[model samples]
Target: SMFNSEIKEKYLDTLSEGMVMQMRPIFAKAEITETLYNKDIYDFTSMQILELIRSFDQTTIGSVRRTLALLSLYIDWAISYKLSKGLTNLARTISEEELYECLGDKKLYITYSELEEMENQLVNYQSKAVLRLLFEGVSGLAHSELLSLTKKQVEDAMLNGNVLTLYDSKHGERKLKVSSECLVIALNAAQETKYKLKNGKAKGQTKEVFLVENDYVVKTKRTSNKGDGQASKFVITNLITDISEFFKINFLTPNTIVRSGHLYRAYQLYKEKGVIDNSVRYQIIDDFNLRVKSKYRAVYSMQDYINEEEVNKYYAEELGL
Candidate 1:
């Protein structure tokens, strides 16, 4: 049985039969190989490659280095075998220090007070809304899903007992019971768009103030017509950077913020019941509509966030010691 034969014949065809056999196992373990199995090799980008590399087991430096070396070799082979010229080896961009730093507990777990402090420090309503939506209550929306929100959705949620409905093509519809504070900030962000519309500055165009219902909740101050009025991804990146600078810390991101929200919820439950059971795990998954994948399930475990003393105590109690 041949797996990833398309990639093999297209990119690795030039290698000798023996070389191909030797490289097969290496390529099979790569996350990128699985990603590119059905897709074109040229579709790969530097960001995608870096993300895949970062997803590798960071606990071992040797494993990370080996993966990088193999990935770099594969990229070189693909570049050489291709008759046309478009691919650049992006694997070499990752530095040795970066890989080492990525090791250890990389999860950023924020407490409720710290999250509130962040909200208080943010100047922009949109940034505040993004922070609150990402970390407040049980809301753990991804950046893509956050940007996909519309003014109508926020407004409808405020009217419909604070329940916001989010629809993803892959995940279908998920209704979230949002905090009133988050909804208030979201409403203010929506009103910012209305003010922009009134002042002939909506979407960086002088078009007449139209209905804001269909417009995206997150709007850019200046944007081209091609953007369709939604804020670019950099908006959230810049927002995170600003928050990090204010806190004098560097490990903040949308994903981490969402993870922190989940951890905070779990910690609260643990404090209340003095134990984390399967029911609590299932409740978090159901409430957040998280995909039941291994990586995600690991986050729900809350092991990384628990302190040494508490962990020891929990195990001692479990063993009836």
Candidate 2:
């Protein structure tokens, strides 16, 4: 409901749901004693304010800083009409630069070769193939698109000159070029997994997916393919999270950070290697079916580069591709 008072609406209407969500718990966490809100503003010691800031370890400097900033705002709001005084803007000293210095850089994505190594370690064939498609499909598909893919699509890409067609909710339709070897892996993966069904046909599937499996990591949530019902079905992110967690436990070295949505990273790797071109550009554009310029930049930036098809053919033969 809208606020009954104009003053309440004026002061509060500017705040967004997202901001409020970030703010409510933050404000509540602070211990606002009467002594802390002392009448003499300068009586508040720097150490006291610092201690309160230190208490808000919200996993990141930016998070804590944002929380502190909101607290500072609320403190000023309290003092504006002398409702409360003696609250200094403690957040003023906690600049973003200081916060960033305190909190070092976050982890970043790993390379395609590193990705392949991770894929090789995965025991599950379906998980392995899904990871491969993320790296090698050159389709730049997010996991949702990858999950929604059907049996016919893989076969079509393999049997029909590496051309794969996809249906996207926003983009409508996409024509993609996938390597035959990539399709081989995805298809082999499909054969090894099964989705739960109620009757003779598939049930409770919102999307027509070819590769489906139970979400449980071991034994069964119940039994066979039935399990705990539709909730037991592994969704796209579930499979990705499983793979990433596996990578984290087993394969993650000091620098190897696990991330999904790696198809763009794959493109960047290809671009670095000089394999991408206008030909590949159009293929990726049609693949993701989005008017993404960065993808096109990586594609268009291909200049003088190595022609590794012969090397690939030899490697393909080595892998029995």
Candidate 3:
């Protein structure tokens, strides 16, 4: 019902079964509709396809670009069948510089030791929980997904001890059989925060486990009458900025800016799980979802995950979190 079954079977059979299976939904997310799909292949213009490429931002760039390349191959079949003619010039026309900007700072993969240093740097429940989910677990949670997480979800995952559930706009749902250590750090963070693990929807209780005031980003300037102070929810960007400022003050050279954090997850995986070129691809697929051969190839082509010496100085010389 998607790409014509006959055309798909006849023309697309040469494509990897795994790739097509992974790509179908991503193609759908591009909002290419049934009308467009059913229309004669000749009607699709290169400009139209480039507009489609512009529709995706950081989160969807990899999937959308990859899917477009595959569909261009489908159009190649259209030419052979005399159904229509010619390539869209889609992949080549998009400038690599634009791509580099769209995919800004995407390659920062931190080391396990760096993560341990981050853990040591950040005290309190919220930061520790964030560190664990983003790095220690298979969840590989994006900021928005992590912000939406409930105490109940964390407790439930701990109860299972075998899988962690994560949701994202791109990947509808992911059930990750993450490591045991990931769960332990998460649970300990919850207990430290006194998080409400039920669905009562109680304020500061049943609400999000990580509220805006988790205060893990910096040393507290907080004071309370009756030892109670209210902390509203935080925008994820502000949180990253907070972490960035911390890094600049404590780690980077005086004039250098701190443009990285969180995405350090891959290196964390590499460090803890021994995932090098040999293992990164298979491990990543299992932790998340299937069969994007090109994406894994991209990962394998990466340089070393982290610069330990660059980030270790402050933490190495210091004594506390």
Candidate 4:
């Protein structure tokens, strides 16, 4: 058998008892196959090793490094014992820079009050709307999706009980039950319009034309030859950068705002339910379109946003404890 006791014992004998226990499940999870003398280390692929590392708690950078290190050590032993010939340690293939980029900065959490403060400070209605939509409207809304939003869609969502529909290439169409406040801001932004004087004006005559329903909700000042305006990714990036600098928060970006939104929603759910159950978990997954690995990472990181003392007091009073 590939999972025979003899092979397992040989591997276990090479490690300390503590390491043996830790590596046991990792080995089993990888579903290793035997290649030489019933030993199972020669057939491991880079993706399999990466997946095994991803299976563990990856909320913190240290946890990710620890898992990779352990796996690399195991592979090193296999190579030393001649069990894996011409096999490279796939765990080491992922560079530190790549890991940091994927995991993001740890200090990305922002309180709801701080987010509202930033929104209040922004003078541009469209900018304010962008902040709210990114932080309060939906989880993980992409820049392209925001740029592609039409005025009719915003008006329709407001008229039809605040259910804003959005489409992303990665996640497809998703409907969000936007907050009343977010809807008001978005509507205001959608309704905003600019007028330009015609090339020749006579008798102080002026044209009055407002943004049509077909126009983009958030658009650049420059209109195209067709008289329709569209915002670019740079516009979004510059606005976010301007807000971040004004607030003295250099780390604030679209990705950080989306992450903060996720944490805020998780905190709200925790407060409402008094616990993060499967229902809450599934709700978050559906809301964010989270993958299996990302689902666990988000759930684990939710603790950072929670107020332990407040939650304890609330539950204590409710339970009469």
Best by TM-score: 1
Clashes (candidate 3): 2
What TM-score does each of the candidates earn?
A: 0.51, 0.38, 0.37, 0.49
Best by lDDT: 4
Q: Model 1 segments beyond 4 Å from truth?
A: 1-107, 136-142, 193-214, 223-226, 293-321
Residue pairs with clashing backbones, model 4:
none
Error of 1 at 48 (Å): 39
> Which lDDT tens digits does candidate 3 get at residues 144-200?
345445545566777786566665445556676655665666666544533322222
RMSD of each: 15.2, 18.0, 19.3, 16.2
lDDT of 1 by residue, 81-147 (tens): 6731556776677654354333324425555555675576555666677777877432323455676
For residues 1-321, write the lDDT of model 4, one tens digit per residue: 235456566877888889988878766654543332243543466644544455442443444566678778877766777777556766677764233222323345555655665566566666777787777544334475687777677778888888877755566676776777887777777666642232112136544233433467675654333336556677677667656544434466776676667666666777667776556756866775553346667666554443444334223333344
TM-score of 4: 0.49
lDDT of 2: 0.45
Question: Judged by lDDT against the true structure, how good is candidate 4?
Answer: 0.59
TM-score of 3: 0.37
Model 3, residue 208: C-alpha shift (Å): 18
lDDT of the candidates, in the order given = 0.58, 0.45, 0.44, 0.59
Per-residue lDDT over 139-178 for candidate 2, one digit per residue giving the tens place of the 0 to 100 score: 2224334545655777777777887776544455667666
TM-score of 2: 0.38
Please give the range of 10 consecutive residues that has the lowest summed lDDT in model 4. Answer: 194-203
